[PDB]
Write a protein that binds this ligand. Structure first.
Ligand SMILES: CN(C)c1ccc(O)c2c1C[C@H]1C[C@H]3[C@H](N(C)C)C(O)=C(C(N)=O)C(=O)[C@@]3(O)C(O)=C1C2=O
Ligand SMILES: CN(C)c1ccc(O)c2c1C[C@H]1C[C@H]3[C@H](N(C)C)C(O)=C(C(N)=O)C(=O)[C@@]3(O)C(O)=C1C2=O
Ligand SMILES: [Cl-]
Ligand SMILES: [Cl-]
Ligand SMILES: [Cl-]
Ligand SMILES: [Cl-]
Ligand SMILES: [Cl-]
Ligand SMILES: [Cl-]
Ligand SMILES: [Cl-]
Ligand SMILES: [Cl-]
Ligand SMILES: [Cl-]
Ligand SMILES: [Cl-]
Ligand SMILES: [Cl-]
Ligand SMILES: [Cl-]
Ligand SMILES: [Cl-]
Ligand SMILES: [Cl-]
Ligand SMILES: [Cl-]
Ligand SMILES: [Cl-]
Ligand SMILES: [Mg+2]
Ligand SMILES: [Mg+2]
Lengths: 199, 199
């Protein structure tokens, strides 16, 4: 079938949902596309190159809150941005593992730059803004990775542990994520407002 | 060579450092142990079973701050516990990926129970204590995963991005982790002390 970049991406994302990240192979992608492996190679050099592109395109397609609304507080931006990142990562099987290890692509530079500048315009030093943005990124990835990989992995319990596992087996991870996110953001705010004061 | 559980673990951890998680195979472990594959199978049924055991034994061996010191504040316990978890995860190649998706083993039940009880003794509801413990776990995993997988993965840059990448390429991830961790813990404290007050 059609082997423009868009269509190759499309097929690889469909395959990802079917196979997961470990099971995804270029041979299987060629099959899906109805082509021979050497044909695919002209378009897609290896699995690494494919995964890198998927990580970018999943966010381009589905991460809609990359930038602050006009007049938005930095707190609200980080909240909305994290929720959006989370959702985008969850949209595909093993989507957080596809993201893991990547760094901002040229196609995301202006976006990331804007996020950093926004933080510095709201009183963060570049370093402190970086630490905030990384912490949210790490927390969000971590939460989604554990959600997705725990699902992939699937009476002498002591009572709090039994109960805590009953709580966890009762939603998908969202409540715990959102509560953690609030804690994170509030801590960032306490730090920012402290300036040079012992806190 | 010797195929007691300890020695099999030992060899698998050595192999993990040599191959990484994706490259680790039972066939390669049998080679390392100087045995044939059917011999290994008696001891180790599959890679999953092996990884599960490694995740447990890495913490048993090297995560020394599972429990609060006598009289320790909950804040200090979470800090020390997170630092210890982080270090243990970093001790082996792809160590955070080995941990990912696991849940507490029978051999960790008393430990995890104690952590939960400790939080509830310090004023947390079980749910709020769970959310704190999960948030620290997720943040720590996320940070280490990104550190380890970014290393595994290894001029039109805009200036803040260029600068931020210079900052990141200057330590291993520790400074950003520790700063984030403080933000997280302080947010937990603001929440705990609020009780039923709008905050
Ligand atoms: C320079 N910049 C801080 C870095 C450095 C190394 C990194 O590994 C990363 C960044 C930017 C962050 C921005 C975060 C942002 N957010 C805090 C989740 C984000 O919304 C985006 C985005 N493209 O909209 C990211 O790329 C991002 O998810 C991401 O993957 C990043 C990331 O991987
Ligand atoms: C019931 N309990 C809260 C759960 C439920 C699901 C989970 O997936 C987990 C826990 C306990 C947490 C405790 C955390 C703890 N810490 C906050 C990092 C920890 O120190 C240990 C430990 N064994 O000392 C964990 O097992 C732990 O790393 C872990 O892997 C957990 C984990 O995987
Ligand atoms: Cl065709
Ligand atoms: Cl076609
Ligand atoms: Cl074509
Ligand atoms: Cl195209
Ligand atoms: Cl492949
Ligand atoms: Cl294949
Ligand atoms: Cl503020
Ligand atoms: Cl405070
Ligand atoms: Cl031998
Ligand atoms: Cl021997
Ligand atoms: Cl033996
Ligand atoms: Cl033994
Ligand atoms: Cl294997
Ligand atoms: Cl092999
Ligand atoms: Cl307190
Ligand atoms: Cl406050
Ligand atoms: Mg990223
Ligand atoms: Mg765990």
């Amino acid at each position: 079938s059609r082997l423009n970049r868009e269509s190759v991406i499309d097929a690889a994302l469909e395959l990802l949902n079917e196979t997961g990240i470990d099971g995804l192979t270029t041979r299987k992608l060629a099959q899906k596309l109805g082509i021979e492996q050497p044909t695919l190679y002209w378009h897609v050099k290896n699995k690494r190159a494919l995964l890198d592109a998927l990580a970018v395109e999943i966010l381009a397609r589905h991460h809609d809150y990359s930038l602050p609304a006009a007049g938005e507080s930095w707190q609200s931006f980080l909240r909305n941005n994290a929720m959006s990142f989370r959702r985008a990562l969850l949209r595909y099987r093993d989507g957080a593992k596809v993201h893991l290890g990547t760094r901002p692509d040229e196609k995301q530079y202006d976006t990331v730059e804007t996020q950093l500048r926004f933080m510095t315009e709201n009183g963060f030093s570049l370093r402190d803004g970086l630490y905030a943005i990384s912490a949210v990124s790490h927390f969000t990835l971590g939460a989604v990775l554990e959600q997705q990989e725990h699902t992939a992995a699937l009476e002498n319990l002591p009572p709090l542990l039994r109960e805590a596992l009953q709580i966890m087996d009762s939603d998908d991870g969202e409540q715990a994520f959102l509560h953690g996110l609030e804690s994170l953001i509030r801590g960032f705010e306490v730090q920012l407002t402290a300036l040079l004061q012992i806190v």
